[PDB]
Amino acid sequence: PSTGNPFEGYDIYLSPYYAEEVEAAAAMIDDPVLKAKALKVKEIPTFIWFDVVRKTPDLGRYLADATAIQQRTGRKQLVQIVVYDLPDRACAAAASNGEFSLADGGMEKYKDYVDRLASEIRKYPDVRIVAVIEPDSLANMVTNMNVAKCRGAEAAYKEGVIYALRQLSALGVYSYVDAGHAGWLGWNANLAPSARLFAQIYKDAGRSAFIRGLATNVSNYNALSATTRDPVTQGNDNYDELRFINALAPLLRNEGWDAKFIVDQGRSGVQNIRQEWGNWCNVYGAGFGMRPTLNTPSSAIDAIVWIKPGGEADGTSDTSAPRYDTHCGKSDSHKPAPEAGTWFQEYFVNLVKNANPPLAA
Known part of the structure; x- marks a missing residue:
């Protein structure tokens, strides 16, 4: 437990998932100035998303790795993760549809997904974990209950999040709910x-x-x-x-609730790039933003972080694809764009280009 900032006095574990994506991205970059800047990105801490249940074993591998780093260097590691697999996920959008369905045993499948995550954590208890809980879930119950899928997903979102919270808290994981x-x-x-x-x-x-x-x-x-x-x-x-x-x-x-906050700034480097505030899909010409830091502008804010890893797509712009959402077809979206969660080279190159503050070689 702790009354104060959980990030305080920890080295942040650097996502190997994102490091390899960035290294492969850098290898394809023509400009040697942009290349050397691209490479700096893998030194910037990001959150590790468990957006599918087949990724749960990766957690044990990350925790083992961070554990080995801790034992070898004597430096305390912190692993940043995202829990993101509710049934009927992202109910107001098609872009990040999700593998679990409430029509097909989704709630029980989701509890098992959480249990799987928990059993990896139990395997390696010496490394602090910060978890972001279910982006684009409960926010929907405030403003999107006109959507059939959201109305049908309400009790599931609440039950799912509460269960995730109770299991992770029992293991001493620090949770921040989206x-x-x-x-x-x-x-x-x-x-x-x-x-x-x-x-x-x-x-x-x-x-x-x-x-x-x-x-x-x-x-x-x-x-x-x-x-x-x-x-x-x-x-x-x-x-x-x-x-x-x-x-x-x-x-x-x-x-x-005297709640604390963390704030994603991973794609916040370029402002004034949206026609409407509701446009969220692969917004064109975005840049890497303010770097992760504990030096925040308010007592309520534990940290500025990079949660969404820049370069991974928000949704597909293919109008013929099952997961196509109209937001990913807008005039201020970067097109053509691949499936949500997959590597979007052109976008990453602009993120690096447009970094604010600029990236160093």
């Missing part, structure tokens, strides 16, 4: 219902101190602190993540 972003849950009308909902999940999950708080901006592109206001944010007083967090935090406290 809480959308400023252009989703930051709108004044959505603030109180969000604080209510996440506080409820926190209660049902036993109020364990290992349930540290919430993760924002996962797989999105919002500024943490906007020097200049992006026009796409007009109408919303919370036009950046800091404003969103500062608006939501005191509401959470009164609802019985």
Whole structure:
């Protein structure tokens, strides 16, 4: 347990999954300046996504690796992971449809997926783990209950997240539950219902101190602190993540949860690149953003992080593909784009090019 920042005094384990993707990406880059910059990216900590159940054994391999690094160097390792396999996943979109279906034993399959993750963690208990819990799940219950799939997935999302939280907390994993972003849950009308909902999940999950708080901006592109206001944010007083967090935090406290936050800035380097705030799929000309750091602009924020690993696609732009979503066909999307989660070379090259602050060789 701990009252304070779980990232404090730890080396962050560097994703080998992402390192190999970056190394292969770098090998194909013409420009030697862009090549040397691309290579710097694998030294920047990212989160490791378990978006499919066949990846669960990889966790044991990562924990064994981090354990061996810890024993060899004497330096404490922290492994950053994402839990992302709810049944009827991403109910308002087709892009990240998911392997588990509520029509086909999805809930029980999901509990087994969590149990599999837990049994790897039990195998290697000497390394601290920070887990992001189920991006693009509960945020849907606030604003998207007009969608048939979301309405049908509600009890499953709650039960699934609560179960994930209870199993991981028992093992001393630090959890941050996904809480959308400023252009989703930051709108004044959505603030109180969000604080209510996440506080409820926190209660049902036993109020364990290992349930540290919430993760924002996962797989999105919002500024943490906007020097200049992006026009796409007009109408919303919370036009950046800091404003969103500062608006939501005191509401959470009164609802019985003094929650902390982490903020994705992995693709936040270039602002003003969206026609609508709701456009999220492979947004064209994005850049790597603010680097992971514990030097944050608020007491509520444990860390700036890179959760979504830049270069992995958000969704396919192929109109004939089963998982095609209209958001991935928009004029401000990078096209042609491959399936969600797969390597998107052209996009990564722009991320590197457009890095802000710029990447060093």
